[PDB]
């Protein structure tokens, strides 16, 4: 319905010894609580990540954008994780080397026009090296405010 819901509790720092699935369940958790996705959303993102990985080997901060099928989404939402230390995602391009991910953009979008808008915003944002480093030092409020400003465009 064109809007993207992004709330202050959709931004979190994660503990160190978290696996890939741990991350995915933790980022999907506030989306589930808010009723923005089906209740077993994490399972679908996990299963999708295994066959179609979402790691982007960009420098200096590795990124992933895990997601699943739009038919599991109820309202557009985005969920953001900051990793204490890298966790490998497989490379979205089919390179053998894993991606040491520090920043995770979980996407729960059901509108095609919002999907493409967000993907394009992410490609731009991850090439802003100052901004990507900032994400590793800012707290949750500064991350939310920072992303909110840049996303609000549409």
């Amino acid at each position, epitope marked *: *319905m*064109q809007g993207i819901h992004f709330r202050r509790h959709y931004v979190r720092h994660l503990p160190k010894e978290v696996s890939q699935n741990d991350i995915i369940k933790a980022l999907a958790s506030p989306l589930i609580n808010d009723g923005m996705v089906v209740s077993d959303f994490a399972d679908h993102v996990i299963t999708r990540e295994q066959n179609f990985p979402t790691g982007l080997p960009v420098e200096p901060v590795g990124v992933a954008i895990p997601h699943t099928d*739009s*038919k599991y*989404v109820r309202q557009n939402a985005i969920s953001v994780g900051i990793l204490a230390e890298p966790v490998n995602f497989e490379d*979205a391009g089919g390179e053998p080397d894993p991606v040491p991910v520090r920043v995770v953009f979980m996407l729960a979008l*059901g*509108n*095609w*026009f919002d*999907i*493409t*808008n967000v*993907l*394009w915003w992410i*490609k731009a944002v991850i090439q802003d090296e100052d901004f990507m480093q900032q994400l590793l030092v800012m707290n949750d409020d500064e991350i939310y405010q920072s992303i909110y400003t840049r996303i609000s465009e549409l």
Partner: antibody
Amino acid sequence: EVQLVESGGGLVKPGGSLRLSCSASGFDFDNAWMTWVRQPPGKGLEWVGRITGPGEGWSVDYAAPVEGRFTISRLNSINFLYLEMNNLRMEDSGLYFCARTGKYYDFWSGYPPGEEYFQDWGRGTLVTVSS
Amino acid sequence: SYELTQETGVSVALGRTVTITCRGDSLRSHYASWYQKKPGQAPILLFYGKNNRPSGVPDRFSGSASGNRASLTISGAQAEDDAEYYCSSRDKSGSRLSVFGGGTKLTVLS
């Protein structure tokens, strides 16, 4: 074997109205984006308009010469797509096609809102607008 | 051929290779998709995006893209390839509308 079957075309006077139908089978219609396309006599394909899916609140977009006059709707319970045409003009004459519509966006090189392509097509229904 | 411009007509000897082109400013931002059509028959999706070919489409059909140009190469034209070919894309960079090229009549000297 996807099946698309258009009907309703016929002779109309300029200023008149006409309602096209598109029967659809063999795929997930309720989630399919659907496009109407037309070929005026002896000319090429012309994009008419397109209706999206549930994730997009079933929004519709129209070709410039056709906005306001044409209406694209759907009833998913019977897998039917419709095109409502009012205040018809000579140059509205043509073979009208319905088409199951896919969506494409390449992450690294793409630009919003990506592109739409037409993977399945019906055989058409003929519209003649004339005095 | 309004926003998207195609050659009116091109011919190619049977067996030989021919590239047909599609030009417009929106192609600087958007990929084109390609369609074959013959009189009396429904169109057929040949190619779309960066490098996608539907199954059942012969591999002699290949699309590519550069600058404001999209192109469809037919490598070793058969008789049944004698047809009209249409390109399609956004009418404008960033647009939700779509548009077709005016079409190219390809004659295969068979």
